[PDB]
Design a protein around this ligand. Sequence first.
Ligand code: ZN
Ligand code: ZN
Ligand code: ZN
Lengths: 77, 144, 161, 62, 81, 217, 250
Amino acid sequence: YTIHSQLEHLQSKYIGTGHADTTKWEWLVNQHRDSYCSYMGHFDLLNYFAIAENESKARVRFNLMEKMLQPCGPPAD
Amino acid sequence: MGKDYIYAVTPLLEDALMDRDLVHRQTASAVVQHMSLGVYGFGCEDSLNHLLNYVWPNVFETSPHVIQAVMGALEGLRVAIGPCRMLQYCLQGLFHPARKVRDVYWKIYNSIYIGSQDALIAHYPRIYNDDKNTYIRYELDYIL
Amino acid sequence: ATVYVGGLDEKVSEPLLWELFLQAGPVVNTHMPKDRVTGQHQGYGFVEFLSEEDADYAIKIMNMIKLYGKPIRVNKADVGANIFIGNLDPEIDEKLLYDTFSAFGVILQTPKIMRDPDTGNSKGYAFINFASFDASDAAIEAMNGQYLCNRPITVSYAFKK
Amino acid sequence: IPNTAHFANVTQIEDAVSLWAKLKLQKASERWQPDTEEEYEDSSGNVVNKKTYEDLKRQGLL
Amino acid sequence: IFCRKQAGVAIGRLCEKCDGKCVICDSYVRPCTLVRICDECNYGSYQGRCVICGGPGVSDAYYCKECTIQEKDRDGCPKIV
Amino acid sequence: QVAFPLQYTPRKFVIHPESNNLIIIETDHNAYTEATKAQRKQQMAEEMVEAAGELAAEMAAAFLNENLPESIFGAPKAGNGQWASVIRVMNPIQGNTLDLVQLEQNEAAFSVAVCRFSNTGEDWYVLVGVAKDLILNPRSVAGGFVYTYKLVNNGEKLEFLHKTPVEEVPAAIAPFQGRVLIGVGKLLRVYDLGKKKLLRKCENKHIANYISGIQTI
Amino acid sequence: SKKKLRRMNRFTVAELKQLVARPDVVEMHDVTAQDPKLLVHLKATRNSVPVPRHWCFKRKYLQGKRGIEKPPFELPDFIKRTGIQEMREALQEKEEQKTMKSKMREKVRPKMGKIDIDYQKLHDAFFKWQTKPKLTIHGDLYYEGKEFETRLKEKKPGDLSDELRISLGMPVGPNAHKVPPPWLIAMQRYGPPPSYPNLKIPGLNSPIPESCSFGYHAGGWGKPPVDETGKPLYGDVFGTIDRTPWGELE
Ligand SMILES: [Zn+2]
Ligand SMILES: [Zn+2]
Ligand SMILES: [Zn+2]
C-alpha cells in the first residue's frame, strides 16, 4: 500500500492512466488530448490536415491547441 | 540468435502453460518474456501470438511470484508483438461488472500505456458520440 | 429429432458418430449414455438432429451403414425371423433392399441374394432376416406375387440351410 | 421464434417478441433483395425495378 | 522502495558483493548503458555507494540490454533508500 | 521536373488510353467557384457605391478591373463549409488544358473512373463522385451525385450525361467486369448503366465505416 | 440508498438487447456494470478478445485439471529423427540398475565418452528440417478442457474420417473420393437430409469423384438419382487469374 502511495503517485506521474472506477469521460478525453499532442508533434499529419481543410500550419495548430481544452463535450454528471 | 530455436521450443512452453503447477506456469512465463525480448524485430510474431493465447488466461492470479512473472511476460510481449495486439487483449475487461477483473485490466493497460503511449493513438477503437458529448475523432477521417 | 442408434457399435466412437451426423445434417447431439459400469456402447443411443426431416433422411441413410462393419440402424428412439424372397429383382442395391424390405420391420440381416459365384449376376432368389415373423408375414403378404422391379416378387417364410 | 442466442436471458414473451421484431426488421434490412433494389429502365427512358420490369415484360410489352 | 526523483548526470556504483547485476532486472549479462542518479541520492556520505548493498562505490552499476530495450532506464535514481 | 499549373487542389486523376490524355479531378475546401467569385466581387462593388457621398468618388471600376493573381497573392476564398471543384482535361506531354468543366457552387468531386459498359460499346464514359454540402469537423453531408460524361472528341472533351443522386459522399469508383463498383459510405453497390440515371444491380451492406478504396483483380 | 437507485437504473437484459445494435454480446452480469452501453459497444468491436471464462468460478484456474492422469510430452519429429531419445533411454536404464558403490566407483573412474551422436545430425535437424508447428491465430484463448473438446461446426457433408470409413464400411485414403459412403446410398434412394438440402452428395447428387465407377455391385456409383424425364435428383449426379506471388525467392 506504500506501493499505492507510489501508484497514485504514478497516477500523478502519468496523465492518462486509469483505475478500476475510471469513467468513460476521463478515459476518452485523455485519449483525445493525446491525439492532439501527437497531431502537433508529428510534422506530417499536420500537412495532412493543413491540406485537407484549406488552412495553413499556424491556423492548424492554433485550432488544435484551442480544442485541447474541452475536446469531448462538457463534463460528466 | 533465438530466431532459430523459437519454433523448437514453443510446443514445450504451451505444454507447460496448460497446467502443470503454479511454478510450471511461473517459469514458462519467464521463458516467454526473454524469448520476446530476444526476437524483437525478426518477425517471429506468430509464435508469440500463439503463446499469448496461453499466457493471458493466467491474468487472474493471486500468488505474487506467479502473477508477477505473468506481468513481466506481458511487457516483453508488448515490445515484441506490438501494442495493438495487447490493447485488443485488454479492451473488453476495462469496464467489466466485476472489480477484480476491472483492476487487473487497468493494471495492465497502465503498463501498456506508460511505455508506448504514443503508438496507441492509431490503435484506439471508434467510440460513438451520444447526445451532449462529441467522441468520434473527425480529425482522423478527413479524406484527402 | 431423437434417433435410436440401434446395433450401436462398441468401438465406433461418438466423435465420428457426430461427424457423420454433421456430414448428413444438423449435428446437434450424438450421445450413447452407456452403462454406469462399462463405458463401452450400450446398443441404443440418442442422436438428435435438430431438424425432424433431417433426422428422418439421415436415418434412412445411416441405416445399413456398416457400424463396426455391422449394419446399424438410426430409428425411432434367432428363432427364424428370416423370409425367403424369390423371383428376385437382380437390379437392386443393398440399401435400396434394406429400405424396400424394412417397411414392415427392422432387418437383422440385409437381403442375402443367392446369386451364382461364376459371374456375379443372380438367378433370382434371396433371403432376408427381418425383425418379426409377423413382419415377414405382412411384408411377404403385401408383396406375394406383387410388383417387384422386373420379375414380380414372391416372398414367404424362409427355409433353413 | 428460433432458439438463437440473441434472446437468451430474455424470459418474458412480450419482450421476446418485440426484440425479435426489431431483429426481423434488421435482417430484412441488411438482406439485399434484388426485387426492390435491382432496378431496370424500360426502353422508354424511365426506370422500374426488376419485379415490375419482368411483370410488364412478360404480360406483353417489354 | 524507490527514490525516483528524477535523473541526472552522476554515475552510480556497485559494491563488490553486488558486483555484476543490473539494478532492477537482476540480470548478469550484456549491459549496455551506464546508470545515473539524482543529486539528493548523490550527496554526502551517499557519494559513491552501492545502490543495492550500500557498500562502497567501486564497480559501475549498468543496465541490462533488456532494460534499455524497454526503456526502464529512463526514470532516474532508483535508489532503495 | 517540369510543372504545369492548376488552380484548385488536385484530388485524383485517371488516364485516357486512346490519346494518352489525362483527366484530373481537382477540388478544394474553403473556396468559392469562378461564378460566385466574380458575382460577390461586383456585388460588393455595388454595396460599395452606396456611401452616398460624392457619387463622384468612383472605385468600382478599379475593383472590377484589378485582378491580383492569387498564385502569389493568396486565394480570395473563405467561409467554413464552402467547397469548390473543377474537372480538367489536359495533355501530359504539353500543358494545354484542352477542356475545362467548372462545376456548381458546393458540389465537391472526390472520385473518378473511366469505363466502357459492355451493354454499349467503345463509347467511354467518365464517372465522377460529387458529394454535396459537406462539413468536416463535425461530420455531415447533404448528398452525393454521380456525374457521367461521354468523353468525346476521341477523348478530348467531356459532355455531361446525367448526375444520379445518391446517399452519401461517393468516395470511390472502380471499373469492374463490364460494370462499376461504387463505394458510397457504408454501402458497396454495383452499378450498371442507363441514360435516365444509373441503376443498381447489386448491394452489399456489411462494410464497417466508410469505403475509401476499391481495388479489384 | 444511492447504490439502490442506480440499481433501479440497473436496466433489464431485454432493455439492453433491444437498445443495442449488436445483440449477440449481451450476457448475464453485463447489467451490473457502471456503463453498459460502452461495455457492449466494446464487446461488439472487431478483433477484440473477451475476458477468460473463469473469473466467476470459485475453483482456481486449473484445479479442475487436478483429477485426471496425463501422458508425458511428445517431442517434435525433427528431434526424434536425430535419435536422441534412445541414447537417453539406454543411459537411464543403465544408471537405474547400477548400485551405490558402483555409482561412486564411476564417480572416481569415469566412463569417459561412453556414447556419441554426431553433429550435422543435430545441426541439420535444427537448421534443415525445422518446421512450423500448428499455431492458433489471434483471440483463441486456451481454457480448461479445451483440448478435450472434440471439434464442431463442420456442417459440411464431404467431411469424412478414415476410422469413420472403416467402422462405417467405407474406404480410407485416395478412395475416400471414389467411395460413396453408405449414407449416399439412401441419399440416392430417397434424398439427402432435408436440413442439409444445401449439401450435395458425391456420386449421388454430385458428379463422379475422380475415376468413379458406375454399376450396381459393391464398389460403384449405381443409378445417379434422376427423374423419369432424365433430370437428376438435384445438381448433377452424373456430371455435365495468374496466381504468381510477387516477392518470392529463387
Ligand atoms: Zn533492472
Ligand atoms: Zn534521490
Ligand atoms: Zn553492493
